[PDB]
């Protein structure tokens, strides 16, 4: 599923990302935009045999298990396929755990490069959420 910007903002808000561990909702919408263009089925294969999955491009080497990634830690204790659903539940649960590490949202390079420090709230303005 490819989410509309405001549609995702409302869903992420329902899923608790608005002001989660100090991060305003704008950060997550902006991050989703740069990571997958709001596409839940986005996948990206890496050189190390790992794959990024979903709307927030979560890695199979550390966060989820796809049953065929070497060095799998499965920190979110979830099959990667759960991160490709039209239902964002699993991706948010995992993101909420990833961001609970000291590195916070710096876990998402696209966020650091394209969102960190900007007027992230711009991403949710205009939205009736």
């Amino acid at each position, epitope marked *: 599923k490819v989410f509309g910007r405001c549609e995702l903002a409302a869903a992420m808000k*329902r899923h608790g990302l608005d002001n*989660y*561990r100090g991060y305003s909702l704008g950060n997550w919408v902006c991050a989703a935009k740069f990571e997958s263009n709001f596409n839940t089925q986005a996948t990206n294969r890496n050189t190390d045999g790992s794959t990024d999955y979903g709307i927030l491009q979560i890695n199979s080497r550390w966060w989820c298990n796809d049953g065929r990634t070497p060095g799998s*830690r499965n920190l979110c204790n979830i099959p990667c396929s759960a991160l490709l659903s039209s239902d964002i539940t699993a991706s948010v*649960n995992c993101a909420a755990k990833i961001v*609970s*590490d*000291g590195n916070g949202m710096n876990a998402w390079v696209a966020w650091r490069n394209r969102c960190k420090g900007t007027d992230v709230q711009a991403w949710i303005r205009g939205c009736r959420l």
Partner: antibody
Amino acid sequence: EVQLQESGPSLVKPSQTLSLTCSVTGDSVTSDYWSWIRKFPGNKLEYMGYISYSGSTYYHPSLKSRISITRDTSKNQYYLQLNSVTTEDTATYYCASWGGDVWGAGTTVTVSS
Amino acid sequence: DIVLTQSPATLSVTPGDSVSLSCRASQSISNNLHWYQQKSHESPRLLIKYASQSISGIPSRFSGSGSGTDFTLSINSVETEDFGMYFCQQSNSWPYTFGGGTKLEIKR
């Protein structure tokens, strides 16, 4: 198949250090974020802190300064250190996964001279 | 620090009765509220995560609802093995905090 177990001195003297070990079995200590939660008399639960995958820790501000959470990847255990204890630190201590899906049986530590 | 207030402090019911336990937050915590059960001489058990999400392996009679500052843990016809303490815990902001708990006891 992940199981946790707390172990350590059951008695600590006022002003001394409380040390507990949490042994992780079934999975690696690097396969999750790990926490320490204690329960005071009167059903009062306190989330003491946790250590995440990067080694970074988060400590409860009310404790902050007296507490340290560390891990040993070779023994697959993580630990709790609480300095300068007082009678008010008497409680049941539990180690648990950050996800809350696995908890140790808990161990009582009493502070008394 | 976020304060969680649970009510009632205690409630006595007959097995088969259905109940609703309240947990209120001093600040909005969105859906970042979890429910635990702790029976006598046992460790806490996670029943519902993120306000309303089911956990595989937990009896279907347990369900959660709410958002923001108002949450409810519901039990469809309480069973003989459900008596004990129930606590809510928030993970929206550090430090994580627990409610004071509600004790579910047997009515006679």
